[PDB]
Amino acid sequence: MPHAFKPGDLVFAKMKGYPHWPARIDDIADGAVKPPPNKYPIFFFGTHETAFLGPKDLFPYDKSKDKYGKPNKRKGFNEGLWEIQNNPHASYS
Numbered sequence: 001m002p003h004a005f006k007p008g009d010l011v012f013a014k015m016k017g018y019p020h021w022p023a024r025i026d027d028i029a030d031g032a033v034k035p036p037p038n039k040y041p042i043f044f045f046g047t048h049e050t051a052f053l054g055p056k057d058l059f060p061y062d063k064s065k066d067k068y069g070k071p072n073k074r075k076g077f078n079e080g081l082w083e084i085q086n087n088p089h090a091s092y093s
Helices: 061-068 077-086
Strands: 010-013 021-025 040-044 049-053 058-060
Touching (some): 021 077, 058 061
Antiparallel strands (some): 010 021, 010 058, 040 049
């Protein structure tokens, strides 16, 4: 059975106006700004941007890739597909 989301989990994350996007649950570094309650820090592959999202917008990657893991014309999307498949746990800083 599923657990709660934890750092390192791979997802597609949904934001308004954007396609379901390859992403990971990030850690919060010591001294870094914490997310709001019930939100997770989401690192978006390709764009390398971060947003705070709750579980309603997080789709586990294994289950969802057949639907959501196709190329898209949006900036950073195809780079992000490569990252989540090939080196999803690397430093992109």
